[PDB]
């Protein structure tokens, strides 16, 4: 994959611009899935100017006369198999161009060579044809495209009405034309020779290859699109899409004249995310806005409220943000309206984008940098884009604008501020009334009874509400979610329970809402929905909150300011009502809001307030959706704000759902109440009820910001109404009828059930007195109502069983377990088969089976050292495997002990904060598990409370003692699937023997990703259930993120099968598997391996008391405390017994089924039948979609060979060859080689080899040194141990020294480059990610997230993008230059100095955990000096040398950045 | 049709230009309920006035004409197996060589026209030219015609006497050379047939005939 762009700064056309454009496209394949087929690829494209010589001649050769104007071309994909349709297609195409009365010189079959296409693709190949049009009407450049635009839509539309498939017009303008198709980019020129003609000349270029979650090639989905080209993904798409359904309700501009209606819907079916973007971007530009304005209105930069930003810009930004809600997601963009050409970034700089400027007056935009030869000699600059920036060219004036200067320009266009000043911030007005006193008007006798209506409890009040009020933070907890899944529940659960928060896995990264809160946002606006098409100050006239969240005080504040303008709808219904009560209720509300809005109303207030003994409340969630949708469905939502008052609301989740299913504003009124009551028994102590709410509110605000970040979304306006949930349990019909689009893969209950349950709980609370809520056993087993998997009896019996070693006791446990009411989906399945039973002896053996079992990754830290190694011993004893876990593994452990026991773990993880990740760690295993996610907390990343960060722990992890370890939610080197792809490459490079796994978490859509993972060379894929365990994690994720494995595991099984990849990868699953049958059923759904954690913990003794986060483990399982660790009685022997039983119980089952082995039953879903009905009312689920087979009946067999999906060599292949002496004799060596952007992970293999023979540190620095001219591609020197040194004279791309491990890497411009070392980029992003040792020197600037997570590498570099030194925990980080926003966020431990010539660092640095001072003590001043010296010595850097020359005056200019938590720890204090 | 009205009336045509079976067929199955070639009943009359039929009543001459047009049709219909006119009507069972796509789509039922051709504009023009000829001037009689047979008229033909001669010559005297002038006679005219619109260029350089 890649996007790129090239432009002649002067405006004047040239052939090189195209030849370069090709040139690029020939250097991106190293980033894609190569087929063994040699031909097949996902899509490539080049968007250049229609070449009028070339075309005109053509018209001449047929013997017409060339017009004076520009001649248009339509580039069109016609149906290729039904001639009947091609015609219809061409009549339509002609008719439409005809009624604008332009002129047709006529069709031209494009030459192409289909030999380089694969069949898959030739299959879906359309018939590519050009049609040539002339501007007989003598209109203007601008009018021609305008008209053509209305024409293309007209066609587009008619073909649709005709119901014609496969028709598609890539381009149709007289300025630009697009040559895209499904073929390898390196072969664009081959599939389309026109491109090789010298008449193809152009002032600009835009190329783009693409990847996918598929095996299927659609042609129209290859880019570049008509104005756009996008690298990344736009996670905020459904959000955007539904907004346009309303934005459109009002869009009207005069340029389209009477055409608008043909103009809508601007977004047709079947578009890829980017495709939809181009769609919007286009209309906007067709109506007048420049390119750069549009990048902004749609992919605006973050308005951090800071000095970093001039005030013009801020105005503008604020303007946009008020018109259009962003289109978020990682995004490198290459854009152009007719005149300008733009390179742009998303608001988080999520994708690479280097660029070079030449003496010849060209700018070449890129994704990597070595992408197209240019002589250093003619380089005038070497830049990049950072979050939010753009760079551009105005081709009419042949002027280049860098970000500042370009943004300057746009600020210039209008009185942004004067206009912005037109908004009413009703904030202060609202805060005022709060301080004036958050009221409360119910008597406990009430609170209690309503509360009972929504089935609330003490656990609810104590466990969850309280901490919010107190700490202003939400409840953290531990252990998995073992309760039933709500539909199956026995006990009133509220709608919000069935909506699961979505989150993101490999497609895009989730953000850090702590360390990166400045880019996020919760602004809310009522009435800012008018004409995205307009550009007038009247667009700022709207009210603005700063949180959709309102305390009963603030709420009324607002509701008053509104007034005649608001309308209140009664979200409630009679109980005397009848079977259809709630239905008609839902109609009613729907209608009433209609009338209101029509009637003139501008704000709606939906509410349960009139709930009483005679009226049940309509589930706020359902009521909000029913309303918002119908509002959209009638083009009305654009006229109001929709505000909800809810008695049932209480936690963060409930807000999130409400908001994103419509809600503008929410007020949890009966909870502020419940807060008060608590407060008048002084449960909060001294603290005023007002400060009370304040906190509550922050907890819910950060609440949301988080839930959002789980699918990288930075901003509530795009999130709102986006329906980002997945419904488990409610009926298809329903979810469709009333909420935005969401999946509900098995219908579930419907209104009639909902009604019945709502009312039942109701009687509970108005049928008689209520002094206390029940206790509740949702977050914990009480011997009360809610059941759980793990309950006391069950735990005892199991313990009894593995301790006394009786299989009979085991069997009694599992029976205890299997004889209950259904609690989980698998519980609803029976296993029946058609074979007679077989004798048990005959089945496969335990030895055999237990080997398919593994003990999941549970970190050293989360668990006691004793527990951890216990597990490693058990697994190795039975020839199985265990998983180190998120947090290091002690290397002493790399040998078997006198007793023969083996503490080393067989599968090592690799997770966001790269904990103990070392060349030697990565090499002490058979398998690497890339942890993208756990079912306990999908969107997010580990926690390890500070008081667990023992010293041993801290030593392991290179973290700082007793300081907390919260991990970055996303991996920093996996922002998109190609990214995954490359990590897997490095992984397979540093360790030639291991298989690589990807931990993913079930959720709908996993299937597809699963595929991409497969194309990315992963060997195993593991789908984790929503219910798995965690040692520490917020409770909403433990109860609301994730989906059951029975759904995700089949989806992966299916989809992978459906694309013929299912044999390329092995499948594993975990999530609550405690029993023989749980394991058989998982096999039949497709699994080959099963993970067993918690139950293995319980055998080691866990009693499931849930204080894993607390460091108070009654039993030594999950606690670092010494005394407490002495109460541990786990034993290998115990765990081994657990597995032994499990397998035997598996064999017992297979025999009954007639199979003599597990393999004979994988995928065999025909052996499972869904029985269970388990409720009073006819409310059933559809378990089909899970049981279905893709290619039922006999399967063909693809031979799979034993081993791992192998990978292509790199430079290391030769380097190693050339190093014989090294390994053979010990010699020292110096090698030289060139290097291209296309060579990845250079050295890594070397390193693996060296680490293996001499170990990370048995070689003295520089022992083997390899100079490289040119460009290093991603992962340069990744995991290099000491002894290796790489000099890259030239430059590099992302991830230099990723996981650096005591090796050394230096990078400087070519002796001959005339560039000013420090005023130019030289290495990409996420450099030194997670390093632990070694040095890195860089004559130049580095890009975003430099030194992220560095845990002990020393570096020197002349500058650095934003988010630098983030989450750093060790090492020294010098920095000869300016530094990006948010520097040092979360930087708990190492040190960075920072030459700052403008005393600006103050404006950029992230205070929170760090401080800066000028050097005072002189050993710190000396430390710096020596590095800088080294730097120079290695890099021959002038600018550096000079700082050395004036040390005296200069030292004065730096700034010591030192972590708070390091102040008292530091041998030599930092101060005098 | 498009506006749901066709189910309300019958659609009846009076046409001057109508003479033979084909014209009726097209008309009919392109809408027509009823047709009446009124300037032919006339042409017939004139014929019958100068006694070209016998002392046969016009009434009778008309009858015959009708019968031929009836069998005119019945026949055109059976070429496609259709046995009944209600079903044939409006069915559009033609194929347009020559008219433009756009046009045929706009105005007639669905019929293919694998190559758009002329459109309203040309039609207009050619219509009007032929109209001048009959009013913006003076006219004695209809020309001869050379449609159904080459006369040494304006309607050309592939096989016209000249070329025939040269061919016959060529192949009797047996000279390739004579053959070669015939082909030229034949190849040098204005286009009369689609192949005629195609040149033959190639990108190889010539090879010696012997090869
Ligand atoms: C205490 C504990 C620690 C865990 N630590 C990690 C970890 O370090 N890395 C990881 O990728 N998943 C971790 N997980 C999840 C497990 O690896 C596995 O996905 C899940 O534990 C198995 O769920 P089950 O508990 O119902 O047996 C942890 C889970 C628990 C309960
Ligand atoms: C190379 S790419 O993975 O960024 C593809 C971009 C986009 N989401 C698409 O589906 O086309
Ligand atoms: O130990 C750590 O860093 C993480 C452990 C963890 O996140 C979990 O077990 O839920
Ligand atoms: S608190 Fe964890 S619950 Fe198991 S580990 Fe101790 S009993």
DSSP letters for chain B: -TTS-TTT---EEEESS--SHHHHHHHHTTT-SEEEEHHHHHHHHHHHHTTSS-S--HHHHHHHHHHHHHHHHHHHHHTTT---HHHHTTS-----SSB-HHHHHHHSSS---SS-BB-HHHHHHHHHHHHHTTTSS--SS-----SSS--SSSS--SS-HHHHHHHHHIIIII-HHHHHHHHHHHHTS---SGGGG-----SSPP--TT-
Distance A998 CA to ligand 2 centre (A): 21
- Count other Cβ atoms within 10 Å, centred on residue B106: 14
Q: Whose CA is nearest to atom 10 of ligand 3?
A: A1030
Tokens (6 digits) for A120: 């898959």
Q: For tokens 């607002």, what's the residue?
A: A558
Q: Report the nearest atom of ligand 1 relative to the CA of A479.
A: 31
- Dihedral in degrees, nearest 10, Cα atoms A224, A228, A233, A238: -120
Of A1018, A1080, A1078, A1006, the C-alpha closest to A1043 is A1006
- Contact predicate A1232/A1250, CB 8 Å: no
Could you give the CA distance from residue A903 to residue A897 in angstroms, rounded to a whole number?
A: 8
Residue of chain A minimizing CA distance to B106: A95
Which of chain B's residues have a Cβ under 8 Å away from the Cβ of A91?
A: 101-102, 104-105, 116
Q: Is A1084 annotated to bind ligand?
A: yes
Of A1058, A1083, A1063, the C-alpha closest to A1165 is A1083
Q: Which residues of A are catalytic?
A: 1
Could you give the CA distance from residue A2 to residue A367 in angstroms, rounded to a whole number?
A: 6
Cα diameter, chain A: 98
Alpha-carbon distance values, A1324 to A371, A519, A709, A1077, A1288 (Å):
14, 21, 24, 50, 14
Q: Name the minimum distance, in Å, from the CA of B11 to any CA of chain A.
A: 27
Q: Is A1096 annotated to bind ligand?
A: yes
- Contact predicate A41/A32, CB 8 Å: yes
Q: Report the nearest atom of ligand 1 relative to the CA of A856.
A: 17
Q: Report the nearest atom of ligand 3 relative to the CA of A967.
A: 3
Contacts of A701 (CB under 8 A, 6+ apart): A522, A547, A549
Q: Report the nearest atom of ligand 1 relative to the CA of A885.
A: 8
Of A1446, A1397, A1391, the C-alpha closest to A1424 is A1391
- Contact predicate A1302/A1256, CB 8 Å: yes
Which of chain A's residues have a Cβ under 8 Å away from the Cβ of B100?
A: 94
Distance B157 CA to ligand 4 centre (A): 102
Q: For tokens 């081994």, what's the residue?
A: A1136
Distance, first Cα to last Cα, chain B: 63
CB contact under 8 A, B102 and A87: no
CB contact under 8 A, A94 and B112: no
Q: Whose CA is nearest to atom 3 of ligand 1?
A: A858
- Count other Cβ atoms within 10 Å, centred on residue A956: 22
- What are the beta bridge partners of residue A1308? A1289
CB of A1104 within 6 A of ligand 4: the answer is yes
CB of A1008 within 6 A of ligand 2: the answer is no
Q: Name the minimum distance, in Å, from the CA of A95 to any CA of chain B.
A: 5
Contacts of A1329 (CB under 8 A, 6+ apart): A914, A972, A973, A1295, A1298, A1299, A1345, A1348, A1349, A1350
Enclosing H/E stretch for A1046 = helix A1045-1058
Q: Name the minimum distance, in Å, from the CA of B199 to any CA of chain A.
A: 10
Q: Ligand 3 pocket by C-beta < 6 Å: which residues?
A: A 859, 861-862, 886-887, 936, 942-944, 965, 1030-1033
Q: Is A842 annotated to bind ligand?
A: no
Alpha-carbon distance values, A1012 to A25, A939, A1000, A1325, A1417 (Å):
22, 20, 13, 23, 54
Q: Whose CA is nearest to atom 10 of ligand 1?
A: A857
Coil, strand or helix: which one is A1054?
helix
Tokens (6 digits) for A164: 């014609």
- What are the beta bridge partners of residue A381? A357
- Ligand in closest contact with the CA of A860: 3
Of A553, A738, A572, the C-alpha closest to A662 is A738
Angstrom resolution of this structure: 9.5
Alpha-carbon distance values, A446 to A191, A451, A689, A765, A1051 (Å):
75, 8, 19, 10, 47
Could you give the CA distance from residue A1362 to residue A1251 in angstroms, rounded to a whole number?
A: 33
SS3 letters across A1248-1306? HHHHHHCCCCCCCCCCEEEEEEEEECCCCCCCCEECEEEEEEEEECCCCCCCCEEEEEE
Dihedral of alpha carbons B78, B80, B81, B85, sign: negative
- Ligand in closest contact with the CA of A1106: 4
Q: Distance from CA of residue A644 to its chain's centroid?
A: 30
Report yes or no: B105 at the A interface, CB cutoff 8 Å. yes
Residue of chain A minimizing CA distance to B104: A91
Which of chain A's residues have a Cβ under 8 Å away from the Cβ of B116?
A: 91, 94
Which of A210, A218, A271 most suits a substitution to test ligand 2, by most atoms within 8 Å of the C-beta? A210
Put simply, the chain A residues between 49 and 88 with a CB less than 8 A from any chain B CB are: 87
Report yes or no: A107 at the B interface, CB cutoff 8 Å. no
Q: Report the nearest atom of ligand 4 relative to the CA of A1106.
A: 3
Could you give the CA distance from residue A1265 to residue A1261 in angstroms, rounded to a whole number?
A: 9
The single-letter DSSP state of residue A729 is S
Q: Is A1099 annotated to bind ligand?
A: yes
- Contact predicate A1304/A1262, CB 8 Å: yes
Which of chain B's residues have a Cβ under 8 Å away from the Cβ of A90?
A: 101
- Count other Cβ atoms within 10 Å, centred on residue B17: 8
Q: Name the minimum distance, in Å, from the CA of A62 to any CA of chain B.
A: 10
Residue A1041, phi-psi category: left (phi > 0), alpha (psi -120 to 50), beta (remainder):
beta
Q: Ligand 1 pocket by C-beta < 6 Å: which residues?
A: A 480, 856-859, 862, 885-887, 909, 931, 934, 999, 1024, 1028-1031, 1070-1072, 1091-1095, 1108, 1118
Q: Is A1105 annotated to bind ligand?
A: yes
Q: Name the minimum distance, in Å, from the CA of B90 to any CA of chain A.
A: 19
Could you give the CA distance from residue A501 to residue A634 in angstroms, rounded to a whole number?
A: 28
Q: Which of B106, B112, B114 sits opposite A95 (nearest CB)?
A: B106
Report yes or no: B100 at the A interface, CB cutoff 8 Å. yes
- Dihedral in degrees, nearest 10, Cα atoms A128, A131, A132, A134: -150
- What are the beta bridge partners of residue A665? A643
- Contact predicate A546/A523, CB 8 Å: yes
- Count other Cβ atoms within 10 Å, centred on residue A44: 29
Distance A864 CA to ligand 4 centre (A): 10
Which of chain A's residues have a Cβ under 8 Å away from the Cβ of B115?
A: none
Could you give the CA distance from residue A1168 to residue A1170 in angstroms, rounded to a whole number?
A: 7
Report yes or no: A94 at the B interface, CB cutoff 8 Å. yes
The approach used to solve this structure was: cryo-EM
Residue A1242: is the preceding peptide bond cis (ω within 30°)? no
CB of A233 within 6 A of ligand 2: the answer is yes
The CA angle A1368-A1360-A1418, to the nearest 5 degrees, is: 65
């Amino acid at each position: 994959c890649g996007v790129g762009f090239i432009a002649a700064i002067d405006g004047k056309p040239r052939r090189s611009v195209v030849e370069k454009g090709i040139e690029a496209l020939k250097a991106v394949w190293h980033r894609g899935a190569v087929d063994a087929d040699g031909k097949t690829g996902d899509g490539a494209g080049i968007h250049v100017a229609v070449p009028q010589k070339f075309f005109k001649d053509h018209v001449k050769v047929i013997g017409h006369r060339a017009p004076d104007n520009k001649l248009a071309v339509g580039q069109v994909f016609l149906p290729r198999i039904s001639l009947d349709a091609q015609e219809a297609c061409r009549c339509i195409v002609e008719t439409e161009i005809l009624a604008f009365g332009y002129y047709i010189y006529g069709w031209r079959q494009v030459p192409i060579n289909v030999d380089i296409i694969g069949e898959k693709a030739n299959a879906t190949r359309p018939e590519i044809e050009q049609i040539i049009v002339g501007n007989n009407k003598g209109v203007s450049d601008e009018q021609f495209e305008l008209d053509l635009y209305i024409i293309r839509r007209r066609i587009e539309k008619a073909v649709k009405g005709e119901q014609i498939n496969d028709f598609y017009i890539c381009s149709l303008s007289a300025r630009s034309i697009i040559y895209k198709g499904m073929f390898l980019a390196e072969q664009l020129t081959t599939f389309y020779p026109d491109l090789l003609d010298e008449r193809f000349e152009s002032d600009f270029a835009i190329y783009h290859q693409r990847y996918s979650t598929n095996t299927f090639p659609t042609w129209p989905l290859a880019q570049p699109f008509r104005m756009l080209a996008h690298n990344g993904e736009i996670n905020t798409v459904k959000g955007n899409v539904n907004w346009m359904k309303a934005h459109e309700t009002r869009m009207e501009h005069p340029a389209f004249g009477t055409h608008m209606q043909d103009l809508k819907p601007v977004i047709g079916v079947g578009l890829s995310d980017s495709g939809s973007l181009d769609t919007v971007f286009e209309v906007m530009v067709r109506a007048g806005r420049t390119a750069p304005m549009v990048k902004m209105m749609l992919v605006p930069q973050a308005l951090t409220s800071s000095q970093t930003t001039p005030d013009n810009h801020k105005a503008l930004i604020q303007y946009c943000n008020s018109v259009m809600e962003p289109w978020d997601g990682p995004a490198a963009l290459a854009m152009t309206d007719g005149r300008w050409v733009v390179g742009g970034m998303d608001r988080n700089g999520l994708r690479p984008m280097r660029y070079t400027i030449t003496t010849d007056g060209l700018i070449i935009g890129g994704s990597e940098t070595g992408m197209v030869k240019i002589d250093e000699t003619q380089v005038i600059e070497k830049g990049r884009l950072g979050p939010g920036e753009m760079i551009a060219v105005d081709l009419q004036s042949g002027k280049l604008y860098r970000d500042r200067e370009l943004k300057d320009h746009l600020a210039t266009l209008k009185p942004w501020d004067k206009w912005v000043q037109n908004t009413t911030h009703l904030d202060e007005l609202v805060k005022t009334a709060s301080l004036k006193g958050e009221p409360s008007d119910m008597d406990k006798a009430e609170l209690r009874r309503r509360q009972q209506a929504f089935g609330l409890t003490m656990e609810d009040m104590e466990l969850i509400l309280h901490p919010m009020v107190e700490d202003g933070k939400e409840a953290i907890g531990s252990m998995g979610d073992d309760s039933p899944i709500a539909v199956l529940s026995d006990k009133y659960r509220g709608l919000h329970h069935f909506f699961r928060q979505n989150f993101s896995q490999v497609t895009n990264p989730p953000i850090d809402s702590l360390r990166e809160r400045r880019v996020m946002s919760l602004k809310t606006r009522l009435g800012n929905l008018g004409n995205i098409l307009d550009e007038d100050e009247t667009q700022t006239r709207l009210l603005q909150l700063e949180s959709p969240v309102l305390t009963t005080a603030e709420f009324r504040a607002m509701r008053d300011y509104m007034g005649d303008t608001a309308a209140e709808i009664d979200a409630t219904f009679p109980v005397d009502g009848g079977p259809e009560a709630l239905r008609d209720a839902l109609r009613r509300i729907r209608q009433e809001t209609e009338d209101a809005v029509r009637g003139g109303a501008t704000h709606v207030i939906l509410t349960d307030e009139a709930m009483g003994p005679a009226r049940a409340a309509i589930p706020a969630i359902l009521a909000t959706g029913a309303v918002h949708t119908h509002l959209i469905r009638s083009n009305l939502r654009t006229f109001t704000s929709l505000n909800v008052r809810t008695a049932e609301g209480l936690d963060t989740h409930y807000f999130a759902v409400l908001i994103g299913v419509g809600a503008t504003t929410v007020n949890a009124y009966l909870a502020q109440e419940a807060i008060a009551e608590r407060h008048r028994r002084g449960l909060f102590g001294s603290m005023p009820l007002e400060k009370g709410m304040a906190n509550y509110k922050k907890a819910i605000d950060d609440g949301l910001l988080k839930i959002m970040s789980k699918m990288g979304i930075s901003v509530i306006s795009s999130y709102r109404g986006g329906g980002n949930f997945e419904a488990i349990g409610l009926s298809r019909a329903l979810v469709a009828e009333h909420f935005p689009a969401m999946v509900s893969r098995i219908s579930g209950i419907g209104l009639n059930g909902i009604q019945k349950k709502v009312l039942e709980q109701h009687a509970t609370a108005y049928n008689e007195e209520v002094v206390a809520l029940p206790v509740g056993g949702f977050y914990r087993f009480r011997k009360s109502g809610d059941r759980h998997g793990w309950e006391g009896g069950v735990i005892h019996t199991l313990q009894q069983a593995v301790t006394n070693d009786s299989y009979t006791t085991f069997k009694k446990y599992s029976e205890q377990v299997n004889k209950r009411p259904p609690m989980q989906l698998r519980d609803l399945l029976e296993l029946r088969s058609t074979k007679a039973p077989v004798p048990v002896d005959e089945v496969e053996s335990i030895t055999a089976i237990r080997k398919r079992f593994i003990t999941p990754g549970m970190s050293m830290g989360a668990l006691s050292p004793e527990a951890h190694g216990t597990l490693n011993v058990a697994m190795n004893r039975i020839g199985a495997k265990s998983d180190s876990g998120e947090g290091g593994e002690d290397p002493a452990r790399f040998r078997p002990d006198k007793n023969g026991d083996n503490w080393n773990s067989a599968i090592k993880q690799v997770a966001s904060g790269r904990f103990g990740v070392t060349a030697e760690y990565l090499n002490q295993c058979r398998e690497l598990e890339i942890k993208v996610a756990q079912g306990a907390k999908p969107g997010e990343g580990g926690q390890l409370p500070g008081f667990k960060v023992t010293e041993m722990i801290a030593r392991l992890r290179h973290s700082t003692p007793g300081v907390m370890l919260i991990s970055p939610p996303p991996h920093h080197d996996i922002y998109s699937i190609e990214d995954l792809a490359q990590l897997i490459y490095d992984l397979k490079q540093i360790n030639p023997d291991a298989k690589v796994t990807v931990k993913l978490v079930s959720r709908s859509g996993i299937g597809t990703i699963a595929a991409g993972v497969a194309k990315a060379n992963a060997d195993i894929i593991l789908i984790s259930g929503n219910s798995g365990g965690t040692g520490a994690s917020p409770q909403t994720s433990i109860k609301f993120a994730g989906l059951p494995w029975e759904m995700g595991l089949s989806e992966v099984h299916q989809v992978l099968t459906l694309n013929r990849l299912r044999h390329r990868v092995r499948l594993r699953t975990d999530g609550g598997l405690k029993t023989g049958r749980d394991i058989v059923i998982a096999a039949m759904l497709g699994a080959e391996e099963f993970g067993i954690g918690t139950a293995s913990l319980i055998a080691m003794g866990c009693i499931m008391v849930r204080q894993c986060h607390s460091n108070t483990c009654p039993v030594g399982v999950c606690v670092q405390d010494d005394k407490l660790r002495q109460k541990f009685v786990g034993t290998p022997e115990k765990v081994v017994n657990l597995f032994t039983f499990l397998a035997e119980e598996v064999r017992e089952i297979l025999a009954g089924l007639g199979f003599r082995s597990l393999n004979e039953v994988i995928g065999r879903t025909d052996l499972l039948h869904q029985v269970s009905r388990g409720a009073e009312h006819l409310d059933d689920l559809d378990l089909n979609p899970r049981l279905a087979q893709v290619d039922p009946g006999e399967n063909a067999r693809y031979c799979t060979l034993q081993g791992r999906n192998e990978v292509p060599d790199t430079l290391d292949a030769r380097i190693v060859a050339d190093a014989r002496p090294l390994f053979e004799e010990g010699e020292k060596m110096q090698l030289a080689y060139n290097a291209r952007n296309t060579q990845r992970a250079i050295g890594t293999r070397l390193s693996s080899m060296v680490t293996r023979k001499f170990g990370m540190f048995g070689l003295q620095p520089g022992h083997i040194t390899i100079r490289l001219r040119g460009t290093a591609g991603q992962s340069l020197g990744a995991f290099a141990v000491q002894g290796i040194k790489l000099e890259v004279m030239g430059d590099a791309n992302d991830y230099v020294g990723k996981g650096l491990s005591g090796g050394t890497i230096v990078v400087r411009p070519t002796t001959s480059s005339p560039l000013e070392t420090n005023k130019n980029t030289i290495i990409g992003n996420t450099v030194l990610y997670g390093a632990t040792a070694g040095k890195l020197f860089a004559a130049g600037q580095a890009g975003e997230r430099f030194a992220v997570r560095n845990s002990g590498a020393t570096v020197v570099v002349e500058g650095c993008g934003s988010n630098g030194c983030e989450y750093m925990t060790g090492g020294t980080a010098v920095i000869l230059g300016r530094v990006g926003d948010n520097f040092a966020a979360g930087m708990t431990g190492g040190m960075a100095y920072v030459y700052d010539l403008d005393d600006s660092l103050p404006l950029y640095i992230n205070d929170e955990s760090v401080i800066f001072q000028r050097i005072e003590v002189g050993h710190y001043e000396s430390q710096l000096k020596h590095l800088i010296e080294e730097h120079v010595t290695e890099t021959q850097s002038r600018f550096a040398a000079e700082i050395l020359n004036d040390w005296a005056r200069e030292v004065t200019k730096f700034w010591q950045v030192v972590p708070k938590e390091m102040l008292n720890r530091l041998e030599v204090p930092v101060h005098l």
